[PDB]
Structure formats: structure tokens, C-alpha cells
Design a protein around this ligand. Structure first.
Ligand SMILES: NC(=O)C1=CN([C@@H]2O[C@H](COP(=O)(O)OP(=O)(O)OC[C@H]3O[C@@H](n4cnc5c(N)ncnc54)[C@H](OP(=O)(O)O)[C@@H]3O)[C@@H](O)[C@H]2O)C=CC1
Ligand SMILES: CCCCCCCCCCCCCC(=O)SCCNC(=O)CCNC(=O)[C@@H](O)C(C)(C)COP(=O)(O)O
Ligand code: SF4
Ligand code: SF4
Ligand code: SF4
Ligand SMILES: [Zn+2]
Lengths: 156, 176, 95, 146, 297, 48, 208, 114
């Protein structure tokens, strides 16, 4: 119908604007912070995608969990995720954020950040390269591109 | 065999004192810093055009794991569990048995890619070049269990990437 | 050399397939069961048996340092061919 | 090598008879209730017990105390030992009283009615070691086995 | 019983509870805490979702890996219902709307879709089916909600005769539409008597109804421990919240007294101690803060 | 590979595939072993 | 033995043996053993009552001047009745040398805090409280430094398991990160690696 | 049998330190329920304090109860200073944990544990 066409074009508009202006809050926990900083470094340059360098956590769009989540910092991660306005996304960078990694069997490590927050992109590596992290951010943008918020709203 | 950083006593004649006062009032070093930033403004940036331009790698690069085969279709892995014995994160889970023609072959070859530390001790422990850590780094997932590889996924990665993996091993096996 | 269970599920080169009353098929609902369709037991059986004139043959798998460790296969039994324990290539004394 | 029989034919779940007379899977509550409802109706010689060949002593005294609560002494084994005379009262008349090690101290071994090669293969291995090193004289009463 | 569905572990996150659940309407208020309480035992939860997958993301940390299977479905597509339920050993229905929409009236949400879910669950061989009615569901009710929910309860009973049908009165929690409705109304006081039940009590009731083989074919009435008049309840809500979207069908249900059904079993017959509202109302309404308890009957 | 082509093998995929995550063609993990313990199937005949 | 063997340093071995005799005869009240390894490191094994008199001496004697505390360590050896082995590593920048002062305690005997000698120790032995449960008396602010705030037990004890007893997850019911008894989806696979053959006959212990 | 003390020469000074620690926790509990904005009552938190003290009431060694008073003061110092979050205070109340089977019969039903 006509309303189906209008909500299709408006979903395309809002998804274009949300994926083309992603603002990350990076948790610089461990070694993956260095490779996030290389994804911001002038070779890869996240800012040319509209992905700014160090937005404040009250205005960020994605939470990049870059490093080991210990048990002593799991509620801090949860509190920052609760303070993020929607639509918020979470990229899990590297093996300790993904599944505990090299510290999986430790007494003090959350076995993957997915026990604390919902995770949208899992970027594997130890550390994953800055090109691999930029790949994960572009896959997150493609995930935002195919969101159907107003179309499902028009069908509900 | 050592040197003194910042042990210069500055000259107190009217020439040097007037030089430092002109630097203070007329902001000469601030213009120097502005000039260096302006000099980078007119340089070509170092930014490659990802995804269309890729970062440089080498045949030693340790990316996505793969199980390899012989040049006959037979898989190289003969179930010796050296890779999971050397595995520093215990990402590899192996169960084996003799198959229908009596060969020593695995029935479980799991690699948890979210325990894996990507150090490639498995591919240097491997005596038949069966497990390799191949060249792929662009294999991010939307779900955690899509990074829990079984034997089928690793053999499919080997069949997918063998044309590149074999040439990287051909480039690097003389250093090994 | 893949085949299929009566549930419509592919059977792996190991032989793994879920039962019909196993709930764990629900993980492939809306998705796919990933199997590899190049079964190595069928591919090594396509290789022709190598006729050699010696009594003991060496095999390293081909490629020299790129193959497996070089082993020595006896070929005195004429009932059975001599199989490489690593690569599965089989040999026969031609006499 | 009999450890692979330890994963075939295994009883994993409680089973009861259905309305059609077939063993169907059930919970522990249903199976133990249907056994206890019959055990409460029994008394005296109404309930007995046969212990098998692989049963630990803990389950043996468990089933003995359970049937003694219903006043039943009929707890039996499948392997017959004669209760004539002293019976199972004194331990000496049903043990290998010497030892397995005491075979090395013997000089005449008399074997009656047994094939100790297959009934107790390392008791036979100890007999052969005493045969070989101590010049043991062995005699057999029974069929001429190897 | 199949070997993969025998319970193992100590009942934690990596355990196996032996419960393979298809929870329709798992993206709501009740489905949130039900999928939480199922996923912490180690249950295979199938969540069929209608909405955007973003709006399901909060269900993902609730279980171990592979223990929540998200899949698309539609209320008017029985093939998707069969695609969701044909591996489960229990199917819980939680589909509901407080308002009728352009595409789904109260008869679609309460009569058509529960009968469809229960019929496809009957013919696929699902062992247990739990359906959630409302306590005040009546054919001669003043509100279309309760009329269609009584009709749908009758149809679920006649198409899945072993269905555990559960009657909650009024559910309160952090994401409710009962105390958050009263805190954001800033309609009146009448002779309406209510006994509201807590969401963790309802969730423990649903899980104990899964585990109980006696709960097949029963009808349970989940009520709170204290009956309140509506006026002093709303005054207690404005007192705890530090205070001085609607429709007329919602107002008809607010002014419906919570009926007394003593012959139906409740939370105590499943082993759930019903939490009084004075223990949890502070937890619910702390967010609305920028208190002597109410009188019962 | 126009100058130096890769070494041809019969098991190498003739069709390359991109990252299939988020699609119905994606990898789903599973145990590749068979069943460890065999259960005793009771007799289907009656016992009287 | 030229290319692949580590060359032995005999001058440093002689000098460290002589200085070990020196320390053992200046402080006979506390020094229990003095030993020098084959790679030329001096260990002074003392009684735990002399943590402050020995370490002040090495800090202040004109022929010691161990002005640096490199590292402070505990080692849990459970077959010893004094199962914790407190290891001080000292550096003399003047004499270009390192010394090791080892002592002992169990769970209940407090070690005297060495913060009055080296302030460097202020966190280190605090770590020894957190990881091992060795109490340090007259410490300024003794509390945990590395474990989580509600942590029970001391992790670097060897009877403490590799994973803990509790693990965290976010729970949406209570809206809170919660602690639960630990379950692993894959148990840590214990590998028995030790060869049944003797490797070093120079380290053979006498039999019983 | 002659050991070095920590703070207490015998059990009398030790019980005095236990008693002062219980006093300090009893005084602290309403401030803890307020500033962490816990969803419990002061009676319930003080019952948890009493439970944690009476759990260790079987100990007859002065050094062990000295270290228990030391660790209780460390817990209290981490609670007065807001070093714990709400999560660390509520880990004493095992709220998300299912109740364990206590009798023989339900432990027999659920698994192999004694
Ligand atoms: N106090 C209470 O809330 C009480 C509730 N109940 C009943 O309990 C159940 C759950 O309650 P509650 O959590 O509050 O409900 P919610 O409004 O919070 O959510 C209901 C769920 O049903 C889904 N749903 C609704 N309409 C449709 C439809 N047409 N097709 C497919 N899915 C649909 C929603 O999915 P989506 O996210 O896509 O919209 C949502 O997941 C309901 O059946 C309700 O009638 C009974 C008594 C008291
Ligand atoms: C919010 C939650 C707050 C959690 C608080 C955690 C603090 C835990 C601190 C624990 C410290 C102790 O347990 S010290 C107790 C050890 N004492 C002993 O073993 C000696 C025996 N003690 C007792 O019997 C004590 O009841 C008394 C009071 C000292 C004497 O009583 P009896 O006489 O009749
Ligand atoms: S996944 Fe590995 S490399 Fe990355 S931050 Fe963790 S420990 Fe460092
Ligand atoms: S790369 Fe290292 S951590 Fe990963 S599987 Fe191989 S040995 Fe294990
Ligand atoms: S991959 Fe290599 S090291 Fe690992 S079991 Fe197979 S043959 Fe052995
Ligand atoms: Zn070969």
C-alpha cells in the first residue's frame, strides 16, 4: 500500500542516519584498547565513516567492549550500558570480551561480556586487528541498515 | 654514557632576555606549533580506503583456523592431540576413533574461537600441517556460538581457504 | 559422500545425525546444519594403488617437508596392500 | 576389556509396567511409590531378595536392613554355599584362608572341583609363579583342564 | 524419556533442566521474567518473536550458549507455530494486548491465536501447554478484554484438554501496567476490590506448573495475599511515589472487582508464597520518586 | 593469480562465499560425535 | 660446553658467598640459612621475627645499601607446616647487586609489616594479604587490592581452585549483577604431564 | 602449642572485639539500606548481620577469631566507604539462587550429590 511504502522509505532514512553516524563508547579494558586506538589511528580512521573518536557515554550509540571484563568491573559495564540511550549496541572485541579467552578459567573473569550485556557483534581475535574491528563495525552498520522498526510498527 | 636532559642555564644578557621576552609576549613557539600542524594539513594522509583497500599482511599472519587435506582429498589430521596439548587456552577439544577403513581420524575437532588466543602454537605443534591458522581476519559474527567451530566448520574453512593457505605455507615453510 | 536421515538431516563423515525425537534439531530450524561434503574416506579410496618393485617403500605424503613424517611400509603381505598410517596412500609390491 | 559392556544395555531410567504389560519410562517418585505400596502390604516371608554377582556391600546391608524392617530374613545370593554344620557363621570355612600371597609359601596345592585358570585367573597366575619358582606340586580333582 | 532431555547438573546456568520451552509472547512483561527463570535452570527456551530483533536483545544474557533460540513467527501463520513448537516439551502462551489494534483485535489476540497455538501444539505432540487467562475473565463482562479472554480460555480448554490455564489477577513489577499506570495517571475511587499478585510469584507458579505432573488440565488462580480497595490502593501508590496512554476498556477493567474463586487452586497449591505489595511496591515505584500501608478488607 | 595461479585441488570450493553470519545460511554449532551410552530397549512383548 | 650452555659466573658466585657469610655472621639472631644458586643469586633465609632488623640492615649498612625493594612475594607450599614463604627481592644500586631475603609463616602467624623499612612494600604485602591471607601487623591500610570487594578466600593458595567458587552474571529479575555457584560449560581439562623418569640426578632426594 | 598472637591474648579480648564489631555493623545497617537504596528492611539486614556472626560462633581459637574480626572490619570499611556497589551488598542475600534440596529424598531425585 502507500503506508507500507512510506514506512519503508522512512526506515531506510532513519537507518541510514543511525548507521552513518555511529558514536562509540569504548571500554579500554585491556590490550584490545590499543587496537581500537589503531582503528582510530590515521591508517584506518573510524572518523571517515562518521564513527567519532571518544564520544561521552551519555550520547554514544555503540559500546565497544575492548578487553577483559573482570568480576570487579562487571557492574561498571552494566551501569554504563544502562545509562546509554537507545538504540544502543554492543560490540564485543576480542576473545576475553567474547568468551573469557585466555582467562576463561580464571576465578576473577566474566566469561564473555554477553553474560552482562546483550551483544550485537562479536569481533574475534587476540587482539583482532584494527582492520578486523573496522570490519565488525561495518557489519554492525549493515545490521542497522536492515532494521525494520517502522515496518514492524506498521504491521503491529 | 649518560646525558643530562634539561640542564641548560639560560643566558642573562639583554639579547637572550629580550629573545625570551619576545617569545613570551609575541608567542613564537605557539606559531611554531601552528606551523607544524599546518604542515601536516598539506601532507597526503595515511588513510587507506577500507573495505576497498586492505592493510598489508604477510604469510605468517595468524587469522582464522582451518583443517587441511593432502593433495588427494584425505585430511591431514591424524588425531594425535598435540595441538590441544600445547593449546595455551585449551580451545581445542578432540575425540578420535578408527574409522571404517581403520585410519586414525578425529570424530570431534572443536576450536572455541572465543577461548583461542590466536598464537598459532597448534599449527607449529602439528606434525602433518593439518591445523593451520589461516589468513582470514574478517569473520566477525552476530552470535557467540557462531564462533564455536566444530570439525565440519574447520574443514570447510580449509576447503574454502586452501588456495591461499598452501601458498602462504609455500612462502614460509623454509623458516619453520 | 553425504547421505540423509529420514528426518531430512544430513549425516556427517563421522556419522553424526540427531534422532527424530531429539529436541536439539531446533538449533537448525530457520538455519542450516553445516556439514562438509568432501568425505575423506571416499576421496582416499579413489587414489590408485601404487605398484612398486621394492620390498619396503618410504612415504612422506608428497611435498617433502610439507607432507607427514617419512615412514617405511613393508609390502611382504600379498593379501593386503600397505597403507600409509598418516596419508592413507596404499602400495603394492608388483612381483 | 569388559568396560565397553559398561555403556551398552544400560538401565538409565526407572521403568514400570503400563496397562498393557510393557516396561515404560517413569520418574523416581512413581517407581519408588509403586515398590513401597507393595512392600507395605508384604510382611514375613511375603518378601524375599536375591543379591547378584556384582553388588557392593553397602547395597547388601541396605537391602538386608530394609527387608529386616518388614521382618524378612530371606535374603539370598545366586551362588550356593552349603549352610550345613557351621555354615556362614565362622568366616574360615568360606574364605581363601591362606592368602593369594600364601600360595608362594605352600609346597603342595590340591585343587578340587575348580578350573582356577578361568574362575580366578590371577590366583592361577600366582599358582604358576609358585610352580615355576618354588617347585610347587599341584594336584587336581576334576576334569583334566589346561 | 530421551537421553538429551534427562536433567543434569546442579540446576545452574550450564545445567540441563530437561525443559524445552516454546514461550509465545516472551518479549513482554511476563515473558521477560519467565525466560529469565527458565534460562537460569538450563532450559532450552524457544522464543518466537514478532517484533524487531533489537527488542529481543535483553533476552539473550538470560541463558547459556544455544539455550535461547529466537525465531520468526506470525499469529495468522500456523506453519511458523509448528516450526516453533515441534521440538518443545512445553509451550507457554503469553500473547496479549491491553489495546486492540488495526491488525489484531481482542478476538485475534485472545481467541484466534491461543486456539491456533494450542491446536498446533496438540497435533505436534507437545506434552505440556500453559495458557494465561485473566482472573476476571467472564462471558458477561463489561470489558471486551475479559469477554474475549473467557472465550479464548474456553477454546484452549476444549482444544488442549490437558492445558494448565492460569488466572492472574493484576500483576505488579518493574515493567508492569498496574502500578506504573497508577503512578503516571496523576481514574477515581469506587467500591472496586483488588488483590494484586507479584510477577516473581506468577513466574514461580508457571515454572512449578511445568514441573508438577498434577497441574495438567487444572485451572489455577494466581492472586495476591491481600485484597485492597481500589481507592486506598491508588492512594498508597501516590504515597510511595511521593505524590500528592489509556482507553475506556482499560478503565472498565480497573473498575472490575477481582472475583473470589476459592475452589480454584492458587500459588500455595504450587508451592509459591505470594509476596505482599508492601514488600515490593517500593522496589517498583522507587523510579517515580523525584509510608503507612494501605488498609485491606 | 592471473600471473601465478593457485594450485588446483578437487576439494577447494569452486564458489567462494562471504561472511554468512546473520543469514539462514550461517554456521550453527553442534557436537559431531555419536551417542556414548546405549540404553536398554525393553521387550515389546508381554512378560506373562 | 661452549655454545649452548649458560656460562658460569664464578666471580659473582664467590662475592655473593662471601657477602652471605658476612650477613650470616653480623646477624646470627635471625639468619637460618644462606645459599647461593648456580646462576649466582644469594638467598638469606631468616626467622620471621627478623624481617625489620635484617631488611633495615641491608637498607642501611654501608656495605649493603640495598636501597631498592624490587619485589615482595609469597609462595604457598602446603606440605610445609609454615606453608607461606615470604620472599623479599632487594636491589643495591651502589654495589650493583641483588639479594633475596626469604622467611616463613602460616595462616595464623602475622608477619611484621616492612613498610617502615621500604614504603614500596605498602601495596606488595597488601597483595600478599589479598592473594594468600598472610596477615601483616602494623600495616597502615591493610585491605584487598586485587580481588573483588565481596571476595571470599585467597586465590593464590594452592588449595584454591583455578576457577573460583562463584561467578557473575547479569540477572534481569533483580536488575543486578549477581554471584552464583560456578558452573563451567567445559570443565578445565587437567593434564597429567610429568614424566615417570628422573630428569635431574643432581636434585635427587635421598629415600626414606 | 605456644603461638604468636595477632591482637587477642585469649578468648575474652577476642570476644570483646567480636562484640565491638557487631555493634559497628548494627549501627551501620540503616545507613547501608538508605544510601545503597536497598530493597530490604533494617530488620532483614540486621538479621543477615546476626546470621554472619552466628555462622562463625563455633570457633574456639583466638587467632582465627582475630582474623575474622579483621576481615569483618574490612567488609565494614568497604561498606561505609562506598566501595561496594549495590551488587556486592546484595551478594549476601542469595536471591537469584534456587533453594537447594535439603532432605535425602529430593537430593536423590535431582542428582548424585550427597
Ligand atoms: N497484569 C498483567 O499484565 C496480566 C497479564 N495477563 C496475561 O498475561 C500475558 C502476558 O502479559 P504481559 O506481559 O503484561 O503482556 P505484554 O503486553 O507485556 O506482552 C505480550 C506479548 O505478546 C506479544 N503479542 C501481543 N499481541 C500479539 C500478536 N497479535 N501477535 C503476536 N504476538 C503478540 C507481544 O509481542 P511484541 O513485543 O511483538 O508486541 C508481547 O511479547 C497476556 O496474555 C496477558 O493477557 C493476565 C493477567 C494479568
Ligand atoms: C549486609 C550484610 C552484612 C554482612 C556482615 C558480615 C560481617 C561478618 C563478620 C563475622 C565476624 C565473626 O563471625 S567473629 C565471631 C567469632 N567468635 C567466636 O568464634 C567466639 C564465639 N563467639 C560467640 O559465641 C559470640 O556470639 C559472642 C557474642 C562473642 C559470645 O556469645 P556467646 O556467649 O552467646
Ligand atoms: S582478547 Fe586477548 S589481546 Fe584482546 S584484550 Fe583480551 S587478552 Fe588482550
Ligand atoms: S592459536 Fe593458540 S590458543 Fe588458538 S587454538 Fe591454536 S594453540 Fe590454541
Ligand atoms: S590437527 Fe595436527 S596436532 Fe592436532 S590432532 Fe590433528 S594431526 Fe595432531
Ligand atoms: Zn604417506
Amino acid at each position: 500500500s502507500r503506508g507500507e511504502y512510506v514506512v519503508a522509505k522512512l526506515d531506510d532514512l532513519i537507518n541510514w542516519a543511525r548507521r552513518s553516524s555511529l558514536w562509540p563508547m569504548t571500554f579500554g579494558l585491556a590490550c584490545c584498547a590499543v587496537e581500537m586506538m589503531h582503528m582510530a589511528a590515521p591508517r584506518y580512521d573510524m572518523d571517515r565513516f562518521g564513527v567519532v573518536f571518544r564520544a561521552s557515554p551519555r550520547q554514544s550509540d555503540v559500546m565497544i567492549v575492548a578487553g577483559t571484563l573482570t568480576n570487579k568491573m562487571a557492574p561498571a559495564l552494566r551501569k554504563v550500558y544502562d545509562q546509554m540511550p537507545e538504540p544502543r549496541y554492543v560490540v564485543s572485541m576480542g576473545s576475553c570480551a567474547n568468551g573469557g579467552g585466555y582467562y576463561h578459567y580464571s576465578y576473577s573473569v566474566v566469561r564473555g561480556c554477553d553474560r552482562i550485556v546483550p551483544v550485537d557483534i562479536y569481533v574475534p581475535g587476540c587482539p583482532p586487528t584494527a582492520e578486523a574491528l573496522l570490519y565488525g563495525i561495518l557489519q554492525l552498520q549493515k545490521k542497522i541498515k536492515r532494521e525494520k522498526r517502522l515496518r514492524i510498527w506498521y504491521r503491529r | 654514557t649518560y646525558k643530562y636532559v634539561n640542564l641548560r642555564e639560560p643566558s642573562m644578557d639583554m639579547k637572550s632576555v629580550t629573545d625570551r621576552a619576545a617569545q613570551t609576549l609575541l608567542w613564537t613557539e605557539l606559531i611554531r606549533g601552528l606551523g607544524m600542524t599546518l604542515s601536516y594539513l598539506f601532507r597526503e594522509p595515511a588513510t587507506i580506503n577500507y573495505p576497498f583497500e586492505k592493510g598489508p599482511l604477510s604469510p605468517r599472519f595468524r587469522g582464522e583456523h582451518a583443517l587441511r587435506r593432502y593433495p588427494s582429498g584425505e585430511e591431514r589430521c591424524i588425531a594425535c592431540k598435540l595441538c590441544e596439548a600445547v593449546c595455551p587456552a585449551q580451545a581445542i577439544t578432540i575425540e578420535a576413533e578408527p574409522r571404517a577403513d581403520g585410519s586414525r581420524r578425529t570424530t570431534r575437532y572443536d576450536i572455541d574461537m572465543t577461548k583461542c588466543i590466536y598464537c598459532g602454537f597448534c599449527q607449529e605443534a602439528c606434525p602433518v600441517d593439518a591445523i593451520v591458522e589461516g589468513p582470514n581476519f574478517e569473520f566477525s559474527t552476530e552470535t557467540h556460538e557462531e564462533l564455536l567451530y566444530n570439525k565440519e566448520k574447520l574443514l570447510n574453512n580449509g576447503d574454502k581457504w586452501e588456495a591461499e593457505i598452501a601458498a602462504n605455507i609455500q612462502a614460509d615453510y623454509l623458516y619453520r | 559422500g553425504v547421505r540423509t536421515s529420514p528426518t531430512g538431516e544430513k549425516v556427517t563423515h563421522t556419522g553424526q545425525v540427531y534422532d527424530d525425537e531429539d529436541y536439539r534439531r531446533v538449533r537448525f530450524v530457520g538455519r542450516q546444519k553445516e556439514v562438509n561434503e568432501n568425505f575423506a574416506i571416499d576421496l582416499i579410496a579413489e587414489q590408485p594403488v601404487s605398484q612398486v618393485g621394492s620390498r619396503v617403500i618410504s612415504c612422506d605424503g608428497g611435498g617433502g617437508a610439507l607432507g607427514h613424517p617419512r615412514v617405511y611400509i613393508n609390502l611382504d603381505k600379498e593379501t593386503k596392500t600397505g597403507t600409509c598410517g598418516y596419508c592413507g596412500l596404499q602400495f603394492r609390491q608388483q612381483h | 576389556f569388559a568396560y565397553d559392556g559398561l555403556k551398552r544395555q544400560r538401565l538409565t531410567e526407572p521403568m514400570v509396567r503400563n496397562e498393557k504389560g510393557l516396561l515404560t519410562h517413569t520418574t523416581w517418585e512413581d517407581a519408588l511409590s509403586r515398590v513401597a505400596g507393595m512392600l507395605q502390604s508384604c510382611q514375613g516371608n511375603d518378601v524375599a531378595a536375591i543379591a547378584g554377582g556384582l553388588v557392593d556391600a553397602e547395597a547388601l546391608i541396605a537391602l538386608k536392613d530394609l527387608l529386616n524392617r518388614v521382618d524378612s530374613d530371606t535374603l539370598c545370593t545366586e551362588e550356593v554355599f552349603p549352610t550345613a554344620g557351621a555354615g556362614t557363621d565362622l568366616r574360615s570355612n568360606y574364605l581363601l584362608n591362606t592368602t593369594i600371597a600364601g600360595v608362594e609359601e605352600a609346597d603342595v596345592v590340591l585343587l578340587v572341583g575348580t578350573n582356577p585358570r578361568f574362575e580366578a585367573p590371577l590366583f592361577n597366575a600366582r599358582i604358576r609363579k609358585s610352580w615355576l619358582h618354588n617347585d610347587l606340586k599341584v594336584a587336581l580333582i576334576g576334569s583334566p583342564v589346561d | 524419556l530421551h537421553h538429551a532431555v534427562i536433567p543434569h547438573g546442579k540446576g545452574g546456568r550450564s545445567s540441563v533442566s530437561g525443559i524445552v520451552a516454546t514461550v509465545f509472547g516472551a518479549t513482554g512483561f511476563l515473558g521477560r521474567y519467565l525466560v529469565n527463570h527458565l534460562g537460569r535452570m538450563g532450559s532450552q527456551v524457544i522464543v518466537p518473536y514478532r517484533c524487531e530483533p533489537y527488542d529481543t536483545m535483553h533476552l539473550r544474557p538470560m541463558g547459556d550458549l544455544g539455550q535461547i533460540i529466537f525465531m520468526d513467527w506470525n499469529g495468522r501463520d500456523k506453519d511458523s507455530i509448528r516450526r516453533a513448537v515441534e521440538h518443545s516439551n512445553v509451550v507457554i502462551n503469553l500473547v496479549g494486548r491491553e489495546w486492540e489494534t488495526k491488525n489484531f483485535d481482542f478476538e485475534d489476540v485472545f481467541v484466534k491465536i491461543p486456539q491456533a497455538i494450542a491446536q498446533v501444539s496438540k497435533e505436534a505432540g507437545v506434552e505440556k501447554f500453559i495458557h494465561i487467562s485473566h482472573l476476571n475473565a467472564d462471558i458477561k463482562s463489561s470489558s471486551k478484554y475479559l469477554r474475549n479472554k473467557a472465550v479464548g480460555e474456553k477454546e484452549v480448554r476444549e482444544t488442549f484438554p490437558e492445558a494448565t490455564i492460569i488466572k492472574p489477577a493484576d500483576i505488579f513489577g518493574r515493567e508492569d501496567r498496574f502500578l506504573n499506570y497508577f503512578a503516571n495517571i496523576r481514574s477515581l475511587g469506587k467500591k472496586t476490590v483488588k488483590q494484586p499478585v507479584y510477577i516473581v510469584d506468577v513466574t514461580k507458579g508457571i515454572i512449578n506448573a511445568i514441573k508438577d505432573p498434577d497441574a495438567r488440565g487444572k485451572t489455577f488462580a494466581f492472586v495476591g495475599p491481600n485484597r485492597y480497595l481500589l481507592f486506598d490502593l491508588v492512594q498508597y501508590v501516590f504515597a510511595v511515589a511521593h505524590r500528592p496512554w489509556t482507553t475506556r476498556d482499560k478503565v472498565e477493567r480497573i473498575h472490575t472487582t477481582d472475583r473470589t474463586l476459592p475452589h480454584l487452586p492458587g500459588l500455595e497449591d504450587l508451592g509459591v508464597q505470594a509476596t505482599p505489595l508492601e514488600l515490593k511496591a517500593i522496589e517498583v515505584l522507587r523510579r517515580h520518586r523525584t509510608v503507612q500501608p494501605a488498609k485491606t478488607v | 593469480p592471473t600471473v601465478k595461479p593457485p594450485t588446483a585441488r578437487k576439494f577447494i570450493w569452486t564458489n567462494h562465499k562471504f561472511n554468512l553470519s546473520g543469514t539462514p545460511q550461517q554456521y550453527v554449532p553442534y557436537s559431531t560425535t555419536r551417542k556414548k551410552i546405549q540404553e536398554w530397549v525393553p521387550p515389546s512383548t508381554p512378560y506373562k | 660446553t661452549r655454545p649452548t650452555v649458560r656460562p658460569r659466573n664464578d666471580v659473582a658466585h664467590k662475592q655473593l658467598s662471601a657477602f652471605g657469610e658476612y650477613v650470616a655472621e653480623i646477624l646470627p639472631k635471625y639468619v637460618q640459612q644462606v645459599q647461593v644458586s648456580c646462576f649466582s643469586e644469594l638467598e638469606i633465609c631468616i626467622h620471621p621475627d627478623g624481617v625489620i632488623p635484617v631488611l633495615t640492615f641491608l637498607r642501611d649498612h654501608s656495605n649493603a645499601q640495598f636501597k631498592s625493594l624490587a619485589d615482595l612475594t609469597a609462595v604457598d607450599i602446603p606440605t610445609r607446616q609454615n606453608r607461606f614463604e615470604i620472599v623479599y627481592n632487594l636491589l643495591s644500586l651502589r654495589f650493583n647487586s641483588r639479594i633475596r631475603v626469604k622467611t616463613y609463616t602460616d595462616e595464623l602467624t602475622p608477619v611484621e609489616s616492612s613498610v617502615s623499612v621500604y614504603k614500596a612494600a605498602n601495596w606488595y604485602e597488601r597483595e600478599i594479604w589479598d592473594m594468600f591471607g598472610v596477615f601483616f601487623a602494623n600495616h597502615p591500610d591493610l585491605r584487598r587490592i586485587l580481588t573483588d570487594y565481596g571476595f571470599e578466600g585467597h586465590p593464590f593458595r594452592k588449595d584454591f581452585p583455578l576457577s573460583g567458587y562463584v561467578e557473575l552474571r547479569y540477572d534481569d529479575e533483580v536488575k543486578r549483577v549477581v554471584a552464583e555457584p560456578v558452573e563451567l560449560a567445559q570443565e578445565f581439562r587437567k593434564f597429567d604431564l610429568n614424566s615417570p623418569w628422573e630428569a635431574f640426578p643432581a636434585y635427587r632426594q635421598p629415600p626414606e | 602449642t605456644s603461638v604468636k598472637p595477632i591482637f587477642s591474648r585469649d578468648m575474652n579480648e577476642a570476644k570483646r572485639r567480636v562484640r565491638e564489631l557487631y555493634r559497628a555493623w548494627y549501627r551501620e545497617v540503616p545507613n547501608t539500606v538508605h544510601l545503597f537504596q536497598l530493597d530490604i528492611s533494617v530488620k532483614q539486614g540486621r538479621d543477615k548481620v546476626r546470621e554472619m556472626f552466628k555462622k562463625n560462633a563455633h570457633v574456639t581459637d583466638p587467632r582465627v577469631v582475630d582474623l575474622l574480626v579483621i576481615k569483618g572490619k574490612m567488609e565494614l570499611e568497604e561498606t561505609i566507604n562506598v566501595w561496594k556497589q549495590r551488587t556486592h551488598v546484595m551478594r549476601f542475600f542469595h536471591e537469584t539462587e534456587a533453594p537447594r534440596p535439603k532432605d535425602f529424598l529430593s537430593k536423590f531425585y535431582v542428582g548424585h550429590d550427597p
